[PDB]
Amino acid sequence: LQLTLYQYKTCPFCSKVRAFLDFHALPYQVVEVNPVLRAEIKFSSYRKVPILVAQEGESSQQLNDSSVIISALKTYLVSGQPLEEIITYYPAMKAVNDQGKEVTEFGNKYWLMLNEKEAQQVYSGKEARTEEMKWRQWADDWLVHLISPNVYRTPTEALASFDYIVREGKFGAVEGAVAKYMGAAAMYLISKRLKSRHRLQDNVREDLYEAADKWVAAVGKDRPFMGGQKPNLADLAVYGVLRVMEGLDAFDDLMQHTHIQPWYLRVERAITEA
Amino acid sequence: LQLTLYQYKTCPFCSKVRAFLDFHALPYQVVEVNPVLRAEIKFSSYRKVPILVAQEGESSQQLNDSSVIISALKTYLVSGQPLEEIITYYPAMKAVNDQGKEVTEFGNKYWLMLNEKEAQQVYSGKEARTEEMKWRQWADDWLVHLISPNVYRTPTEALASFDYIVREGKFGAVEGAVAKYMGAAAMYLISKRLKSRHRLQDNVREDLYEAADKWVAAVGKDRPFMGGQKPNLADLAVYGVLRVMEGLDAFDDLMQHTHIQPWYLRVERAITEA
Ligand code: HEM
Ligand code: HEM
Ligand SMILES: N[C@@H](CCC(=O)N[C@@H](CS)C(=O)NCC(=O)O)C(=O)O
Ligand SMILES: N[C@@H](CCC(=O)N[C@@H](CS)C(=O)NCC(=O)O)C(=O)O
Ligand SMILES: [Cl-]
Ligand SMILES: [Cl-]
């Protein structure tokens, strides 16, 4: 079972997949995608990264949405059911936007295709299962929208972030130097629109802190992670989403004003412990 | 198990719920919602119809999306699992539109929460299960978008349709006479935009006929319905969606130019046979 992950390292959707693979000690290779030319992805009719192709010797299936990848792989790890059949339970649902745009959403994306035995094996608590589902969705429908406006809220942070983008990702020597400044400028302005369009407070940091408190509160003081003893897909989701900011001002702020660090480090070490 | 269905009779989403309840001979009461004032719905924080509240003596849960209602009730009929727990597996997923609008989608909406035994009892064929899921989604992400532009493509049909709307539904004597003309006018013009926005051919009828052929072809000549022996959620979905046009020109056209009538009548009589 060989796994190749096409990604943008500092992109939350990819950080999520990595968090999951890292925690389930699954071996995988990563091919960094050039965000400008995206050549390493020209082979996939699915135009968004991350994309992960799994290979079983001769067989090979392409898993697309980041949450779908995680769900497919996860149910795979517990049910053993052939992966070529599992991605079938996460159908790509095309539909024309109310604005006339073709959009694809993946059905059942946050639901592990498990049977009674299997479920009990990973949740042991019917409500615990619908819970990660709810927070998994929360992670990328709310938490991620707090990143850009936060890591690009100031021209300095903007440059810091895009610098961290060019260094980390795959940019030619030239498309990098340029991209840092054009990029930070673009993103600084664009994040302004995102700040607005997503109904964020004027003080973007406060939406981040609140989100964090909401999460720690949800985790509660009766358990290490939402997954209880060990982290479940929800812990990995929030963590995966938040990590992308490691090294940036927003992250230190987040850590210094929210009581979320203990949970965060707990997941980080739960992961490093392969 | 008392069921109350709040609806707009001629509305496809409601026609779908009725097709399902009708087929599973489930007793239910319907309270027609006044599309203008919507007073009979003022009690629900969920602002779309259909809505169906189920009551078990003292207990009572509100099922919201039309497909969610069908999926909840259906898994309920086969698993016997308490309905208050089942609606839990169809979480309401809020998210801010790319246009900045708060939108709610229901997770797992096309998936019956069944275990191995149960599934074999209703599908007997792993692929047969993912199949209705695919067509269920097809029914309301494509088929329904063919209705308005078809039953409102002409000022005459427009009036015919809205006449059938005021008569059928709940409109005061006055808000009815007015609504027929204001309504038909509005819908005639609005359907034009829908025709465009949804990428329909200029000859709106052709999109309908093609959709129908696609469906009959899908069903094939080796089985009465997609559900095979009896209809499954997919047959009820397409049927439920198409019925809304019964009595209108588009429906007769649909019936006279597509080879879909035999399947249609099969579902209709399958239903009348309580
Ligand atoms: C190369 C490094 C990249 C990074 C670090 C990055 C980072 C992010 C982040 C943090 C978000 C969430 C912020 C928000 O939605 O307000 C986001 C969203 C998004 N990104 Fe990227 N991105 C990258 C490249 C790209 C590229 C090249 C494209 C276009 C081809 C792209 C398209 C999008 C889209 C469409 C969304 C919104 C997805 C959704 O609605 O959930 N991103 N990206
Ligand atoms: C009273 C009788 C009504 C009937 C017969 C009716 C019929 C329909 C039909 C046939 C469609 C699908 C056509 C298309 O999407 O192009 C539709 C969609 C829709 N209707 Fe109604 N409708 C009614 C009332 C209303 C009212 C009062 C509202 C607003 C409060 C409403 C809001 C919508 C919306 C938002 C959609 C699109 C849903 C989606 O994206 O799947 N409808 N309606
Ligand atoms: N919901 C998707 C997100 C896909 C996405 O937005 N990916 C971006 C990179 S951050 C992309 O490749 N952009 C292509 C596009 O949106 O056209 C997932 O979880 O994988
Ligand atoms: N996808 C929903 C459709 C809900 C819907 O569009 N309902 C319309 C009537 S056709 C409504 O009540 N409109 C409220 C709104 O969209 O604001 C379902 O299957 O129940
Ligand atoms: Cl592209
Ligand atoms: Cl309203």
Q: How close is the nearest chain A Cα to the Cα of B174, in Å?
A: 32
* Parallel, antiparallel or unpaired: strands B2-7 and B51-56: antiparallel
Domain boundary among B51, B80, B109: B80
Q: Both tokens of residue A96?
A: 């024309």
- How far is residue A60's CA from residue A75's CA, in Å, rounded to a whole number? 17
Q: Answer yes or no: do B74 and B150 share one domain.
A: no
CATH number at residue B216: 1.20.1050.10
- For A29, A111, B92, the CA distances from A234, given in Å and listed in that order, are 24, 12, 17
Which residue from B267, B12, B261, B47 is spatially nearest to B145, judged by alpha carbons? B12
- The secondary structure of A167-184, three-state, reads HHCCCCHHHHHHHHHHHH
DSSP A235: H
- For A177, A182, B42, B66, the CA distances from A248, given in Å and listed in that order, are 19, 19, 47, 45
What b-and-e string marks burial along B88-98, b requiring 16 or more CB atoms within 10 Å of the CB?
A: bbbbebebbee
Q: Answer yes or no: do A40 and A140 share one domain.
A: no
DSSP B81: -
Q: Both tokens of residue B118?
A: 């149960």
**Burial class, B119, CB count within 10 angstroms (exposed 0-12 / middle 13-18 / buried 19+):** middle
Cβ A180 vs Cβ A159: under 8 Å = yes
DSSP B36: T
Which residue from A183, A115, A112 is spatially nearest to A152, judged by alpha carbons? A183
> Inter-chain contact A133–B107, Cβ cutoff 8 Å?
yes
Q: Answer yes or no: do B111 and B160 share one domain.
A: no
Q: Answer yes or no: do B165 and B260 share one domain.
A: yes
Mutation for testing the B interface, residue in A48, A94, A98, A146 having most B CBs under 10 Å: A98
**Any binding-site annotation on B66?**
yes
- How far is residue A26's CA from residue A118's CA, in Å, rounded to a whole number? 19
- How far is residue A66's CA from residue A12's CA, in Å, rounded to a whole number? 9
Q: Both tokens of residue A142?
A: 């709310």
Cβ A267 vs Cβ A235: under 8 Å = yes
When divided into structural domains, chain A yields a total of: 3
What b-and-e string marks burial along B151-165, b requiring 16 or more CB atoms within 10 Å of the CB?
A: bbbbeebbbbbbbbb
- How far is residue B171's CA from residue B257's CA, in Å, rounded to a whole number? 34
- How far is residue B101's CA from residue B95's CA, in Å, rounded to a whole number? 8
Structural domain that includes position B31:
1-80
- How far is residue B214's CA from residue B207's CA, in Å, rounded to a whole number? 10
CATH number at residue A46: 3.40.30.10
Q: Answer yes or no: do A90 and A159 share one domain.
A: no
With tokens 């000859």, the residue in question is B203
Please name the amino acid found at residue B31.
V
Domain boundary among A80, A110, A137: A80
* Helix B155-168 / helix B249-256 crossing angle, nearest 10 deg: 110
Cβ B183 vs Cβ B165: under 8 Å = yes
Resolution of this PDB entry, in A?
A: 2.8
Q: Answer yes or no: do A130 and A228 share one domain.
A: yes
- How far is residue B251's CA from residue B248's CA, in Å, rounded to a whole number? 6
Residues of chain B contacting residue A130, judged by C-beta atoms under 8 Å apart: 88-89, 91
- For A21, A244, A272, B160, B257, the CA distances from A251, given in Å and listed in that order, are 23, 9, 20, 61, 63
Within 10 angstroms of residue B211's Cβ, the number of other Cβ atoms is: 22
With tokens 């069903």, the residue in question is B219
- How far is residue A204's CA from residue B250's CA, in Å, rounded to a whole number? 52
Report chain B's terminal Cα–Cα distance, integer Å.
Answer: 18
- How far is residue B112's CA from residue B70's CA, in Å, rounded to a whole number? 9
What b-and-e string marks burial along A216-241, b requiring 16 or more CB atoms within 10 Å of the CB?
A: beebeeeebbbbbeebbbbbbbbbbb
Give me the active site residues of A, please.
8, 11, 13-14
CATH number at residue A98: 6.20.200.30
**Any binding-site annotation on B68?**
no
CA B75 to chain centre: 18
Ligand 1 centroid to residue A12 C-alpha, Å: 8
Please name the residues between 146 and 205 in chain B that touch chain A, using a CB distance below 8 Å: 196-199
Q: Answer yes or no: do B161 and B254 share one domain.
A: yes
Nearest-Cα residue of chain A relative to residue B118: A115
Cβ B270 vs Cβ B231: under 8 Å = yes
Cβ B147 vs Cβ B245: under 8 Å = yes
Would you list the DSSP string of A132-153? HHHHHHHHHHTGGGGHHHHHTS
Residue B92 phi, psi dihedral angles, 5° rounding: -85, 115
Q: Answer yes or no: do B95 and B205 share one domain.
A: no
> Which helix or strand (DSSP H or E) is residue A7 part of?
strand A2-7
Task: Give chain A's length.
Answer: 274
Within 10 angstroms of residue A264's Cβ, the number of other Cβ atoms is: 22
Helices (H) then strands (E): counts for chain B: 12, 6
Q: Answer yes or no: do A221 and A261 share one domain.
A: yes
Counting one residue from A and one from B, how many pairs have CB atoms under 8 Å apart? 76
Q: Answer yes or no: do A75 and A101 share one domain.
A: no
Within 10 angstroms of residue A18's Cβ, the number of other Cβ atoms is: 20
Show contacts of B95-99: CB within 8 Å, 24+ apart.
B95/A137, B95/A141, B95/A142, B96/A141, B96/A142, B96/A145, B96/A197, B96/A198, B96/A199, B98/A197, B99/A99, B99/A197
Within 10 angstroms of residue B202's Cβ, the number of other Cβ atoms is: 7
Q: Is the dihedral of CA A129, A130, A135, A136 positive or negative?
A: positive
B164-B168-B173 Cα angle (round to 5): 95
Which residue from A153, A72, A59 is spatially nearest to A109, judged by alpha carbons? A72
Ligand 1 centroid to residue A11 C-alpha, Å: 7
Q: How was this structure determined?
A: X-ray
Q: Answer yes or no: do B52 and B176 share one domain.
A: no
Query: Is omega for the bond preceding A50 within 30 degrees of 0, making it cis?
Result: yes
Q: Answer yes or no: do B90 and B119 share one domain.
A: yes
Residue B95 phi, psi dihedral angles, 5° rounding: -170, 145
